[PDB]
């Protein structure tokens, strides 16, 4: 676009939803984060 | 229950929908203008829907004009 700059000054950026939803106050929050342990898997018809 | 219309874009385009395609419309408007040009050229060449005193000139003038109006009809259709 050789010329369109007139619009460029009052033009508007797109808003930061990723971190806004990241930093929302959450009810699972913990002072120190622990990764969950491993869940039981399915080892086949004999093992369960 | 619900019919959802959206834009399918493979990452090539950030538009949901454009307007009329202005390239097409501009194109055929230009063509129509050019045919009116040639038709006027020969109308004033013999003058030196158009009804004349010469069969050849009536022929080609009317062909030109008809085609022009067809183009304009495509724009109008758009």
């Amino acid at each position: 676009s050789i010329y369109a700059h007139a619009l460029s000054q009052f033009a508007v950026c797109r808003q930061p939803w990723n971190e806004y939803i990241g930093l929302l106050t959450k009810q699972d929050s913990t002072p120190y984060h622990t990764e969950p342990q491993e869940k039981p898997a399915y080892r086949g018809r004999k093992q369960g | 229950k619900l019919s959802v219309l959206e834009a399918a874009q493979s990452g090539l385009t950030d538009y949901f929908c454009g307007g009329l395609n202005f390239e097409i419309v501009g194109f055929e408007l230009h063509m129509a203008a050019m045919l009116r040009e040639r038709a006027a050229a020969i109308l004033e060449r013999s003058g030196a829907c158009a009804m004349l005193l010469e069969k050849a000139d009536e022929r080609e003038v009317n062909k030109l004009l008809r085609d022009a109006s067809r183009y304009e009809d495509r724009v109008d259709d758009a």
Binding site: - | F22, L29, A33, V75
Partner: protein, 96 residues
């Protein structure tokens, strides 16, 4: 130049009213006068009086916009000039 140059761009974190107005006038001058005035006429024709009744409904508005569009598109201004206005840069390079 006595010394090697550097090239800075300077962004303003604040627009003033005068500044903004300068921008918007710089655009109004940058587009076809006939269609500026025309479109003003069209807006004030749809708007009508401005009362909730006098505004055109959708069916009349599409028709009105059509009337103006149809009348303007004929002019060399739109098809010969303005249509190719918005082309990308590489398009103009390929055409040149």
């Amino acid at each position: 130049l006595r010394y090697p140059p550097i090239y800075f761009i300077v962004k303003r974190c604040t627009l003033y009213f005068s500044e903004w107005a300068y921008a918007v006038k710089h655009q109004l001058l940058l587009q076809s006068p006939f269609a500026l005035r025309a479109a003003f006429g069209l807006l004030q024709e749809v708007r009508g009086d401005g009362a909730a009744e006098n505004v055109m409904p959708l069916a009349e508005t599409l028709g009105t916009e059509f009337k103006y569009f149809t009348r303007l598109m004929r002019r060399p201004d739109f098809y010969r000039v303005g249509v190719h206005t918005d082309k990308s840069v590489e398009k103009w390079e390929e055409i040149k």
